[PDB]
């Protein structure tokens, strides 16, 4: 409904997670990350198709179409003040800290590298945006766990919300932390499907279990800037109840985006050859438009 479109791009959304008392069997392999599933809620229509058309796009004229709209991203400082959070770190255990916080967002960007329009040239097709790309979720979203002592809150930025390697990761952080939430909020890219993962009263037993695998497969007890690869953790795909758990969230996101994607194809597709156009305005519009009865 456009009810539930409108309010969750304005207001923002989230879940609560459920814990796991037992970590799933754990089987660390870096380099490749395991391939988006049907079991785990791939669906091309939904998340793919209209990244697809915009990919398409000259970025010249993609930049263009997106100058007013590209603001800066700030929703982990949004976050740090809800949670009062004071200071943060990112690794080290010399420094006291509220949080640890791991950001894998591209950050103020939309696009990896200048490209010309595409008219499917081989019927090829690598995603040149930084939107349903599974590859962007490294190693180092667990990053936060080596050097997490007695901190509150694990804060990190997911960079996408599609294939399976992003679920796989949250069902881990199910079982180390006993409160775990998955937010997008307002001051967030609604371009991207980037969200914000909160996790808080630690499980340090487990967590442990978890640290001793790891350092056991990377053969080292620091992290490593050489294990920011692909990878892959899980053997067996985890609870059906998980992942439809995980799904009701990722619905209403890629929900949001076919609309946001939607007007924004529209509007560099227009027949008036304009960025003044009716897609343009509406999209603008929703975007842009201050919330002033928060403020003022």
Known sequence: GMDEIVKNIREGTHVLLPFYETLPELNLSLGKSPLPSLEYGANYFLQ??????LNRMPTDMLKLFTHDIMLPESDLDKVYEILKINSVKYYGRTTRADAVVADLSARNKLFKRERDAIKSNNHLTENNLYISDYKMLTFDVFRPLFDFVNEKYCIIKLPTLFGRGV???????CSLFKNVRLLKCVSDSWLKDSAIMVASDVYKKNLDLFMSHVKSVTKSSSWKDVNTVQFSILNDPVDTEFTNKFLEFSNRVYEALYYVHSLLYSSMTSDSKSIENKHQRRLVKLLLHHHHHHHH
Do not use: G, Q
């Open 167 to 173: 679920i796989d990761t949250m069902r881990i952080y």
């Open 48 to 53: 793919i198709s209209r990244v697809n058309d």
